[PDB]
């Protein structure tokens, strides 16, 4: 359809806002939930929180600012949980940082956040006349030296590959995006509304369908920061500015029997685990390679 | 001391005097006493010269208030909203009339130092001096040591 990219962004934001208002109006009253703190530092702590309003970020604010600074992920008694997602019922919370003994979940969440950021930068750094479709965020483990993102470009862009100047421009765009603090908001929607939210990316529609297939209730996790909306697995980091060092290593063009997809690879390190110059150079040189992991 | 006090430019309220003159004195309220020896001048003025002044100046509301007060005062409220308070304590009728005429002829502005004794809007008739208003032009606008 004849729709400008800014018009698409506005429509997506408006539809997400309507769904958010519906989710908020689903509960007319403010119920009291009794949340325990099963953490290691302050045991026995009890919080009288609001249902579908209070957040683990508000719990950290109740505790102390050190928690708001350190704790990235939340474990609600059985599962990970982002900071900006409202609580549902009474439960117990345990905070999770980067330097913990088992930080695997937080590392994967940071990986997904960086992948979504790189995807947004790639989607919004290209020209209007060219068509660009994000496929998904390939879940690669932490051992892989970079986070990858799959992008299908126009048919006329299948000849050239981004040079060092283009990679540096992408890195500058990512740094400028990080400079302005953007909160990651997570919402639980249905495929029936996700299809009309996207309505343009056939790959995104197929991804939503295959993610809702394994979901008995057809529940899809949407993530949105600033003006960009994307679907991804697992929770995300609360703030964007947590990503201190960020680089776009290179891109790898993989060809299939259906179409060819650019696999953009990026490297990132937060402010809590920033490294030295030589260490960063070695890690970037390692990320320069090819990363292949789908199942 | 100019640096100690404030300063303002010579301005007129609502561009008075251009189209028609408007007496800037809106109201004049005397507060005096009937038995105090200090209010003798104010009493004699209210007896003698308030009617002639009221007839001469119709655009000013003149209020008179005899009340149990010790110091005779006069409050002039102008069109700009300014309130000027003066003391007529033990002053002869001539001095009272002089002060009344002064308050009538005043404009109500603040009595501070005036920087410029003149104020002309657009004084740039026939042109204003600029560093190029008296230098001749060369052929083609060439710089002194520029070759074409």
């Amino acid at each position: 359809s004849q729709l400008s990219p800014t018009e698409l962004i506005e429509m997506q934001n408006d539809l997400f806002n309507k769904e958010k208002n519906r989710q908020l109006s689903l509960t007319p009253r403010t119920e009291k939930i009794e949340v325990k703190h099963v953490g290691k530092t302050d045991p026995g702590t009890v919080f009288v929180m609001n249902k579908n309003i209070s957040t683990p970020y508000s719990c950290a604010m109740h505790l102390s600012e050190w928690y708001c600074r350190k704790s990235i992920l939340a474990l609600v008694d059985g599962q990970p949980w982002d900071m900006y997602k409202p609580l549902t019922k009474s439960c117990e919370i345990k905070f999770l940082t980067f330097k913990d003994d088992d930080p695997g979940e937080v590392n994967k969440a940071y990986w997904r956040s960086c992948a979504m950021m790189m995807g947004c930068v790639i989607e919004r750094a290209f020209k209007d006349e060219y068509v660009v479709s994000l496929v998904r965020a390939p879940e690669v483990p932490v051992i892989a030296g970079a986070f990858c993102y799959d992008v299908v470009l126009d048919k006329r862009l299948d000849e050239w590959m981004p040079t060092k100047e283009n990679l540096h421009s992408f890195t500058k765009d990512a740094r400028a995006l990080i400079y302005k603090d953007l909160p990651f908001e997570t919402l639980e929607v249905e495929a029936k509304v996700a299809l009309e939210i996207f309505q343009h990316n056939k790959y995104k529609l197929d991804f939503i369908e295959e993610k809702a297939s394994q979901n008995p209730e057809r529940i899809v996790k949407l993530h949105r920061f600033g003006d960009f909306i994307d679907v991804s697995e697992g929770p995300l980091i609360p703030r964007t500015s947590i990503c201190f060092q960020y680089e776009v290593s290179a891109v790898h063009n993989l060809q299939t029997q259906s179409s060819l997809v650019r696999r953009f690879q990026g490297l990132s390190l937060p402010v809590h685990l920033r490294a030295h110059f030589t260490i960063w150079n070695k890690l970037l040189e390692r990320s320069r390679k090819m990363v292949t992991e789908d199942k | 001391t100019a640096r100690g006090t404030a300063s303002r430019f010579l301005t007129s309220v609502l561009h008075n005097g251009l189209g028609r003159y408007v007496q800037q004195l809106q109201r004049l309220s005397f507060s005096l006493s009937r038995d105090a020896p200090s209010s003798r001048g104010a009493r004699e003025f209210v007896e003698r010269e308030v009617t002639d002044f009221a007839r001469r100046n119709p655009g000013v509301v003149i209020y008179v208030n005899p009340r149990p007060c010790c110091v005779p005062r006069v409050v002039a409220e102008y069109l700009n909203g300014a309130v000027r308070e003066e003391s007529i304590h033990c002053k002869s009728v001539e001095e009272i009339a002089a002060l009344v005429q002064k308050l009538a002829d005043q404009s109500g502005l603040d009595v501070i130092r005036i920087r410029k004794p003149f104020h002309t809007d657009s004084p740039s008739i026939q042109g204003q001096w600029h560093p190029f208003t008296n230098k001749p032009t060369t052929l083609g606008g060439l710089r002194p040591r520029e070759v074409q």
Partner: protein, 166 residues
Amino acid sequence: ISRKWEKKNKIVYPPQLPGEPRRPAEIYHCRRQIKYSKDKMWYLAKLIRGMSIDQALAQLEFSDKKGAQIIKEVLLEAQDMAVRDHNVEFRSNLYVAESTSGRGQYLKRIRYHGRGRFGIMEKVFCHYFVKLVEGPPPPREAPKTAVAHAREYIQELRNRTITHAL
């Protein structure tokens, strides 16, 4: 003496009409008759001025001055008051707006020098006043940049007028 920084905590504001922005809560507190010195307490006050309560307590925990523990106790008591008495949730959502140190009533003693000479030794005492405002800490003022300097200089050049001309 004078006691107004404590009475400032008992004022009542009219109810906020529906539609007006939420006014942040303000809590005044003070510690009277501290054995510390006026200037030495003012140093810590200036150190913890404008910072968040969390970072202020973190700095006071490691500060080697004797007044560090004093100001830490004062801040803890002020936070407890803001939580219990005042309707201020999120006990870590406070920032120090003002933190000052003044003098109080001294004591005079005789300090001997020698050769029959003496001095009036002054036992010092200082009051410490603190104000906590609910909300995020205000950002630090950045140094003026070259672009702002150039704009202000162009403005000052343009605001000139021909003096003593008319």
